[PDB]
Amino acid sequence: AAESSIQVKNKGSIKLSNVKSVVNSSGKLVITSRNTELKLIDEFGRTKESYKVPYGAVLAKGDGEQVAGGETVANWDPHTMPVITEVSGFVRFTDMIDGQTITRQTLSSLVVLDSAERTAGGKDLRPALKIVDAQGNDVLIPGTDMPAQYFLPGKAIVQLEDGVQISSGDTLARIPQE
Ligand code: NA
Ligand code: NA
Numbered sequence: 001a002a003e004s005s006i007q008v009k010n011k012g013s014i015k016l017s018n019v020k021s022v023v024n025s026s027g028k029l030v031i032t033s034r035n036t037e038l039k040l041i042d043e044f045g046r047t048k049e050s051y052k053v054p055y056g057a058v059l060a061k062g063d064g065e066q067v068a069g070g071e072t073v074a075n076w077d078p079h080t081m082p083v084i085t086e087v088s089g090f091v092r093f094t095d096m097i098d099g100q101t102i103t104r105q106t107l108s109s110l111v112v113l114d115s116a117e118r119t120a121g122g123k124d125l126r127p128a129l130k131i132v133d134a135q136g137n138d139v140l141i142p143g144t145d146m147p148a149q150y151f152l153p154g155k156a157i158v159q160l161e162d163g164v165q166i167s168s169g170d171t172l173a174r175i176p177q178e
Contacts, residue, residue: 004078008067012040012048016063022086024169029059032084032169038074040067056082056171080174083156085166087131087148089139093162094128094149101127102158112173114154127152129160129172 020033031053038059040049053059057076061067096102096110100122105111112127131139131148139148152158156173160166 001078004076005072006038006051006053006074007072008040008049008069010040010048010069012042012067014059014061014063014065014067014073015039015041015045016053016059019063021059021062022169023167024171025167026170028169029062030084030169031055031057031059032086054081056084077174079177080157081177082171083150083152083173083175085129085131085148085150085170085172086141086168087139088167089131089133089148089165091160091162091164091166091172092130092132092136094130095125096127096152096158096162097122097125101125105157107159110158112152112154112156112158117154129158131166 017037018033019031019036021029021031024030034055036053038051038053039047041047053074054076057074059074061073067073098104100119102110102112115123128149128151133139140146141148150172152173153175156175158173160172
């Protein structure tokens with residue numbers, strides 16, 4: 001619990017460095033950058049506390065917000081790391097076939113078969129969740145001309161249904177972690 005959240009020990013303001021954040025469909029302010037540092041500072045920039053904050057962490061307070069001592073200001077899953085969409089749209093399953101690239105596992109979930117666990121044809125397959133607009137047009141990742149296709153590494157856990165509406169910052173899949 002403590003290893004996967006930040007609770008500040010004194011009042012101060014949140015200062016985030018190297019951060020990209022977006023609000024998802026659950027009303028969570030989610031960090032989508034991978035080398036973010038969160039600092040508790042005073043009004044003059046003196047550092048009180050400093051923490052690294054992982055990709056996918058949820059913030060209760062954004063950059064520049066004042067917080068009081070004892071307040072929990074970030075939370076992330078201790079045992080998984082997410083794959084998060086950077087764009088809003090609708091989910092489209094790609095190369096996701098039961099028994100060949102994914103298996104059902106149990107609430108139920110789709111689990112991506114790693115390379116060795118796949119049928120002959122499946123080893124050439126690359127399961128992905130593509131984000132499309134309402135019409136089915138490919139959506140591009142912001143900053144690039146690259147499509148918002150998120151491939152799933154083996155053991156990735158997916159709970160989304162195909163075709164479902166999705167918002168930027170929503171988790172596409174979770175990679176099981178120690
Ligand atoms: Na946590
Ligand atoms: Na969003």
